[PDB]
Symmetry: D2
Subunit: 116 residues, 4 copies
């Protein structure tokens, strides 16, 4: 998978499981076209999101449904969601890992970019 | 100012100065209506953004132009921008401070919510 | 005015109040000697740990008792504490603001240095 | 398999490679005795610092030499190092993954604990 996501829960000290994640690609008319979606695994990852066939050059938006997640745990959080927007594969295909550490009133995101 | 922003540069160890910040409020038709904009000061803050008169209940989006910022320093970064979306004043007027710590391939955002 | 510590509670969305902060300086014998102490205010910060004249060049260790802070809320957190170790005023005086964002299993620390 | 350390370079967008990591355990005399050591791989991680049998209940200090890492790139960073101090296996065995995201004037540390 050239597009990976690792979502962690800083309150409980575990991976954030069942977190909805929607990915969009910027269309020629500057709109956001759905590209891929999934739910985080027990390890806090997205399995089978895309492949080198679909993951082409372009600007991508990765939307993490942190609100539903916290609310499912009986917690009312600050953010409506957590968004990560970046240009991908603009210099040859790459492997991208998006780390997201979650707290009800805080989130961090770190991108790791390597050669497949 | 009931809406404050503190933007830090983790590379240089200083406040992120001259960082463009655009704020939007969700309109009745789910579109993003411009609400306020500015550039961070020498202390990394936005002065005179809004007041208790305009800062009413609603969903707000705070967009930080982290890309221009890094690029101005001769650095090509990961993110297209950093976004913070949250419901404000939904339980009585509040004072919100949005902390944003910036690195070229990472950013964190923490919200501090207090009583004015 | 030269050393400021700001502690945020990433879980509740507020300043971390009444949090113990201990500062140490590295002694010639490579031991850590007490230098300053406080408890964060209602605004989660300490600003009077030291002064421009007292804060001399050296290696300082700022230690935040995050364990007690979480334990009170009935939480069993990961860290025994959060600590920042840094050389101060190595290349001349500077003002230092250390931001600490805390969660039970995560903490970040960011320094803004000026002068 | 029980203790994993993952080190990321928030500036370059990559794993922090060849980063020194030293582990210590708190001794009965309240001193820190060496327990394990390594250098992160091309993937910025260490996984073989210890084993299920060796990793007994106690207070561990994981120390990452971030200073040397930044200094090589010609950078004068804030921290002398990044260290995580925590009680392991207090309430029975657990697997521990410690994530460390590094920048010259900022580092976060997050632990994922399971079992």
């Amino acid at each position: 998978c050239p597009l990976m996501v690792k979502v962690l829960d800083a309150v409980r000290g575990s991976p954030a499981i069942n977190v909805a994640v929607h990915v969009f690609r910027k269309a020629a008319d500057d709109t956001w076209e759905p590209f891929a979606s999934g739910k985080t695994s027990e390890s806090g990852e997205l399995h089978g999101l895309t492949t080198e066939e679909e993951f082409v050059e372009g600007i991508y938006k990765v939307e993490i449904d942190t609100k539903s997640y916290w609310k499912a745990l009986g917690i009312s959080p600050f953010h409506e969601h957590a968004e990560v927007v970046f240009t991908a594969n603009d210099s040859g295909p790459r492997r991208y890992t998006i780390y997201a550490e979650l707290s009800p009133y805080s989130y961090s995101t770190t991108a790791v970019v390597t050669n497949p």
